[PDB]
Amino acid sequence: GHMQNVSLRELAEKLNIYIGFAAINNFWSLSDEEKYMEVARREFNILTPENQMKWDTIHPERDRYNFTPAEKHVEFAEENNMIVHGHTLVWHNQLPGWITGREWTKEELLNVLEDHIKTVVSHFKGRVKIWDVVNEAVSDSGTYRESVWYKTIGPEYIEKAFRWTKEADPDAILIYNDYSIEEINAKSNFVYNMIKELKEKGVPVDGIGFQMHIDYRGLNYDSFRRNLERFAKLGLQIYITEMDVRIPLSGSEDYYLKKQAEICAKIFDICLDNPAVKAIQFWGFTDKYSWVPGFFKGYGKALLFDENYNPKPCYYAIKEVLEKKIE
Numbered sequence: 538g539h540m541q542n543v544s545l546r547e548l549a550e551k552l553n554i555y556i557g558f559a560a561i562n563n564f565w566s567l568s569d570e571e572k573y574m575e576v577a578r579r580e581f582n583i584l585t586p587e588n589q590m591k592w593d594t595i596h597p598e599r600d601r602y603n604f605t606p607a608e609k610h611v612e613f614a615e616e617n618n619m620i621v622h623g624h625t626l627v628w629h630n631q632l633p634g635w636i637t638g639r640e641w642t643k644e645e646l647l648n649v650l651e652d653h654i655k656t657v658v659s660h661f662k663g664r665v666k667i668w669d670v671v672n673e674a675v676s677d678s679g680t681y682r683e684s685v686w687y688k689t690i691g692p693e694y695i696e697k698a699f700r701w702t703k704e705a706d707p708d709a710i711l712i713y714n715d716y717s718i719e720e721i722n723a724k725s726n727f728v729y730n731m732i733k734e735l736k737e738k739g740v741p742v743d744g745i746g747f748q749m750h751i752d753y754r755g756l757n758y759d760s761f762r763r764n765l766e767r768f769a770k771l772g773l774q775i776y777i778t779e780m781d782v783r784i785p786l787s788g789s790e791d792y793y794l795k796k797q798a799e800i801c802a803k804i805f806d807i808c809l810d811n812p813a814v815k816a817i818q819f820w821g822f823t824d825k826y827s828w829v830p831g832f833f834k835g836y837g838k839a840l841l842f843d844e845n846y847n848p849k850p851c852y853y854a855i856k857e858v859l860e861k862k863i864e
C-alpha cells in the first residue's frame with residue numbers, strides 16, 4: 538500500500554524542496570509544547586528559530602555568547618530530520634544595549650561585526666544549512682536603510698558580512714532576506730542591483746529570501762513571477778522565508794479564509810514552477826502562535842492551522858497544489 542498521512546514535508550521531499558516554519562521562543566516549554574512539537578515534526582522539514590538566534594539572545598554582552606536556546610532549536614530539527622535555517626546575523630532590530638547604547642566608529646563596529654559573525658557561524662558550522670546573513674538592509678524608499686551598521690560603516694558592511702560568513706562556514710548557503718520585494722518595484726530594483734553588484738565583485742551571495750508577509754489582497758502574480766525569474770538569472774537560489782497571509786479580524790471569516798487559500802495556492806503554483814525556489818516557510822504554523830496580531834493592528838489568522846491545530850482552508854489548498862505537481 539502506501540502511508541496513511543500525506544504530510545506537507547513528505548510532499549516537499551518528492552518535489553526536492555523544503556516546507557517549514559519559524560519556531561517560537563522556548564517552544565519546548567509551552568503549556569501545549571507536546572502538541573506544538575508533534576504538529577511541527579509531522580508537517581515540516583525546515584526550521585528557522587523565530588528570535589533565538591538573534592543578536593539579543595545569542596550575544597547578550599560584548600564578551601558573552603549564549604548558544605543555549607539556539608542549541609535547543611537545532612537539536613529538535615536534527616532529531617526530527619529537519620534542516621536549520623539561521624536567522625539573522627546582521628539586522629537593525631533586536632540589538633542588545635551594549636550595541637545601541639554607545640557611539641561607535643567605523644573600525645570598532647567592523648571589529649564587533651566580524652567577531653559576532655565568526656563566533657555564531659563557526660559555532661554552528663555544518664549544522665545550519667542556510668544563513669540569513671543580512672536582513673532588511675533597504676529602506677521603504679529603495680535607498681540603503683539608515684541602521685547603526687550603515688551609518689557607522691557605510692555600504693561595505695554588507696559585502697563584509699557575506700565574506701566573513703563564508704569564511705566561517707564555506708558550505709552554508711548565504712542569503713539576503715527582505716520584505717515587500719516579492720514584486721517588481723523601487724525596493725526590489727534596489728535589492729536587485731545591489732546583489733547584482735555584490736556578485737560581480739565575487740561576494741558569496743548564494744540566494745535571496747522573500748519574506749512574503751502579505752495580506753488578503755494577494756500579489757500581482759505576473760510581477761512576482763517576473764521578479765523570481767530575474768533573480769534566479771542572477772544565479773541565486775530563492776527562499777520564501779516568512780510567509781503569512783494576514784486577514785481582517787472583523788467580518789466574513791469564511792470569505793477571507795477562502796481568499797487566503799487562493800493566495801497560498803497561487804503562491805505555491807508560481808514557486809513550484811521555478812526550480813530556483815528551494816524552500817517555502819511560514820512565519821509560524823498555528824494561529825495560536827503568530828507575531829501578526831501584535832504587529833498588524835486589526836489582522837491575524839495568517840497561518841496554516843487554527844488556534845486548536847486544525848488545518849484551515851489554506852493548508853488543504855497548498856497540499857492539493859503539491860499533490861497535483863507530483864501527479
Ligand SMILES: O[C@@H]1[C@@H](O)[C@H](O[C@@H]2CO[C@@H](O)[C@H](O)[C@H]2O)OC[C@H]1O
Nearest residue numbers: 587588672673714715716748779828
Ligand atoms: O516575535 C517577533 C518575530 O516574529 C519578529 O520577526 C521578524 C518579523 O519581521 C521579519 O521581516 C524579520 O526578518 C523577522 O525577524 O521580530 C519581532 C519579534 O518580536
